[PDB]
Amino acid sequence: AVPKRRMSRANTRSRRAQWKAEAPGLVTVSVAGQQRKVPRRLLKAARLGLVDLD
Amino acid sequence: MIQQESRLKVADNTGAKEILCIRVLGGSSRRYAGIGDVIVATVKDAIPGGNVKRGDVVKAVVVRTVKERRRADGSYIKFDENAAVIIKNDNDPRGTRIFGPVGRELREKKFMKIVSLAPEVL
Amino acid sequence: PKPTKGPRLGGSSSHQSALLANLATSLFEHGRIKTTEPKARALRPYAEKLITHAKKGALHNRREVMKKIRDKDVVHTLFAEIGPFYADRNGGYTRIIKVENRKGDNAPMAVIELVREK
Amino acid sequence: ARKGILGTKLGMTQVFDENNKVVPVTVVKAGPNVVTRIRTTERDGYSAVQLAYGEISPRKVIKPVAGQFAAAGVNPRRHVAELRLDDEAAVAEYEVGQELTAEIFSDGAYVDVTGTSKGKGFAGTMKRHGFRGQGAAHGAQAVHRRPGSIGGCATPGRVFKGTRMSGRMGNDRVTTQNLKVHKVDAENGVLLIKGAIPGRNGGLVVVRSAIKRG
Amino acid sequence: MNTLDFVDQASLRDDIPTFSPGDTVNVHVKVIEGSKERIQVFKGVVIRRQGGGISETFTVRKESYGVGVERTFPVHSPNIDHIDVLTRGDVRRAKLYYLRELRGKKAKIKEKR
RNA sequence: ACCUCGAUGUCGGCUCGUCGCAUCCUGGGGCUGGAGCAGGUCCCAAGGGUUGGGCUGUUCGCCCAUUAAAGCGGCACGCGAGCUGGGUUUAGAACGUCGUGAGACAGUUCGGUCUCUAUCCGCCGCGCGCGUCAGAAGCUUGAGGAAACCUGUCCCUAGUACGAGAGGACCGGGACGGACGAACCUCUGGUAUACCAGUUGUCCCACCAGGGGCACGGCUGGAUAGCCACGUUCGGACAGGAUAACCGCUGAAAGCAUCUAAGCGGGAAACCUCUUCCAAGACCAGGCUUCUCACCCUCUAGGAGGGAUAAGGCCCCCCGCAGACCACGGGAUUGAUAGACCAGACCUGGAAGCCUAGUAAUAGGUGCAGGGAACUGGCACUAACCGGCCGAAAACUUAC
RNA sequence: AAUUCCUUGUCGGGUAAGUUCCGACCUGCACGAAUGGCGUAACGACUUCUCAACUGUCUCAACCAUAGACUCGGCGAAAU
RNA sequence: GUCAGGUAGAGAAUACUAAGGCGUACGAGUGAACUAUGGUUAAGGAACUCGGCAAAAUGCCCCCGUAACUUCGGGAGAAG
């Protein structure tokens, strides 16, 4: 089918607001004497040196 | 598990060789016929000279079924062919000899004449 | 192992078989391999079953491994270094470490290594 | 006035009767239930007995639930569920801390077994409502499992509520009624209930006395 | 092991020979037709044996009066009084469904010894 | 000829319904033109159900076999952004009739493209956010809803009123059913794209042996788990209340008074409880428990604005038979959550190697062998992390 | 006569119900072809039907895989 | 338009492969429904449907053996 009316600004924006990113949950990891923030998912990899922290 | 248009062999000496199930009796929309279930059929093949002619609408009781039938004791009975015996409204066989084995479902359903005439009721 | 519940990992059952075989070969060769996390998860049981065959060092187990690995050098590596190395370890011969996702598709990535702590 | 016991659907198997007839029996761990709370018309407005079932670790149990069990005077248990009773004498029968064993039922007692059915996921109309599928051939274009028509035309002008459409099925409360208890294994705290009971193996179930065939 | 083995062991019975698919065996089935309990002997080839514990069933096939009859029983069925293995069979698979399409002398089965 | 010709898609069938009652069971009245009975005609009271085929474009019908019955209609002659396209009505063609002809034909025939990713409402399911007067937590609790409601034979009553028979009951009491629905997987049976086995062609692993890749999982024989039905089990109920027709009251506003008047009391499937399920967003938000029973800072020291939080919960992580993306279980190991490993179960069916017998194909022993998965136990060996986010009261009026 | 409008009824054959069609009896000045009507082996992706076999077309649907759909990341329209 | 390896094979079909050339340009995941393309299917077996549409089935080589009718060629690979 095809949109019959132009969607109003209010509806367009109400439903567009749902397209949002979720900020990652960052935990502290100590590497090379420095305290970096990495996802708890990558916590182990960062400890083992498998995360490129630049 | 016999339904409409299923072809069964006649386990009887009525001259009819094969029948086509027209209806499974037992209730409206009654779907399947197992051992001991009665069906009105039509004779599709028959001995050229005999009591039963081709195209005769008859009543028969399924005596052997290819689909395995469960039993109260957890056992099952299965046959190599679907066979019915042509009967009359007295629930008695139209013929005099029953060929091949039959199930105890006939005894349960009070097809006692068929059970007695059957060479082996399993 | 337990079969893949969902769509097979290589886009087909044959490709999943080949892909698991290659991943197991690479893991047994280089010790650790980086690959998409689902591939690591599917490989870990596969690789550990192969390592179990290696531990049961025998010609029958050698043949059972060679019907999946097809690499004679890696088969020898298994049966001469990885079976003897894990003789004392009862299971859990591999370790999955979740790493950062790829820049091209954001695919979850994981490094699967052979355990060495003993 | 109506017995009941919380249990777990251990599995299903078959036994044999005195007549050698096979009885398909679900084996349910009608394990010990501890009466944690009594619901009364004076305090609660209804007559019910709260039962707790299943071993849980106190570390797992949270402080609100732990305090409720402390007030009851009993060790916290994994599940808690209420059994409704008609009259007040039914709860006068019960008391907090009471031990409810599978022996409350007897062989041949008809029970209603309530459980959460298996999750069938997002099911189509054919699986979910028994919709007659459309034809596999004879021109049918990509409608072999689709619902068909949904409403009328301009006159309703809409789809009625309760229209049987495709959606998530299963995971709903189901009470299978008048299931005969073939045997009451008092030694193992188990009930062999003839037939099937809703839900997966290991799921929480409530075996109450049959409401109809009391 | 199975979670319901403590329930199944009660119904599991002894007096079950070590029959295998392909063994010719006669099962003595109790039939209570007409209030009278008698024994009917079903002699045939074990073409199948599926299941475990109490729920295990075995299928016996015999040709009778020109009609092949398969009759399945639970292995630990109380309605079976005795299963007697007449001769062992040297079959090459667990299930002998192919014996359904075979008739006459081609339905022979090799015997171990 | 009033909307629609800058388009409102036709008949039939399919699919899915929903509604009406103008009744094909369940209750009655009359006829008893049944004196009677089995039956039946007629007229008053929708919950369910109301089959499958053949010939039909077939809207209609007829036929076959059943059925308790095979209801009639509305919903754009419901339903083509749901399907088909047989009919019908383009363009080809033949025949028949008309026409000089082009052509025409509610004439007979064959052939003849069914588009669209759903914005809104609607509906079916899921979440996120807020509420619900502190911040949580289990247990709920029915206002209101939804689902279901079908009905057969056979037996006893009973060969029992008629009392000539033939034939043959109501009402009750049992057995077994058909269709439908739900759950479930013990059985049976289906499936099985990492299971086992056999096997063809080919190419490989140097070669033999043993295997692998590909050929639909190459094919074939099986096949546990899961999912299933053809399977298993269960359900429609039993009761209560209010209701057409049938009555009761002493008998009147009215006389031997009178079914009944005005008043007041008693007897179906429909209705309301009852059964199952949802359900406090039920804006009118229950009995318990948990922390606290304010930790700190800033403008005001009113009313607020932020941190930390106690309580609990997400997010991450291991996961599931829970799943489109949610929520449920386990876990910051104080752990069996998954995998592995060890066993068992189960499926296959007798592995590899070696030895033996055969000029060999192959067979036998090693050996219930080997291989293997979902199930069941063990087993911290691997991963569940040496972690981050949220998450507490303005009070005032009114008896003791 | 070979001539099928044939509505031809009647009867059958074929189905349990059998369309297409096949037969005899049929149909009277007929009726339509002394050359435009009938036959005709072979042939036909022609139209119609009956059989055997076969089957998920169906009773009546179930399960498996893959491409979508669905989830995440990137790019990113359309009719209206 | 030219060349046309090997093994099966009649073959330039088909399968697998040599040489040679490619993995071709969105990916990763995920057992939803539903759609598409494949696969299997108990018991029936056209009961589906306008219609056996689709699917299923037969399928190759060698021995036999092959009907009505015929234009004497065929039908015919009849059929079995």
Ligand SMILES: CC[C@H]1OC(=O)[C@H](C)[C@@H](O[C@H]2C[C@@](C)(OC)[C@@H](O)[C@H](C)O2)[C@H](C)[C@@H](O[C@@H]2O[C@H](C)C[C@H](N(C)C)[C@H]2O)[C@](C)(O)C[C@@H](C)C(=O)[C@H](C)[C@@H](O)[C@]1(C)O
């Ligand atoms: C594939 C691609 C095409 O799809 C079709 O062909 C479908 C299958 C036609 O139906 C086919 C089949 C069928 C039966 O469909 C209705 C038929 O009637 C039409 C004529 O052709 C359509 C839809 C016709 O519409 C229908 O036209 C009728 C005249 C009236 C009807 N409505 C207003 C009443 C209207 O929607 C019509 C004319 O093509 C629409 C116009 C816009 C088009 O030309 C567009 C460009 C089409 O080419 C197309 C959509 O791309």
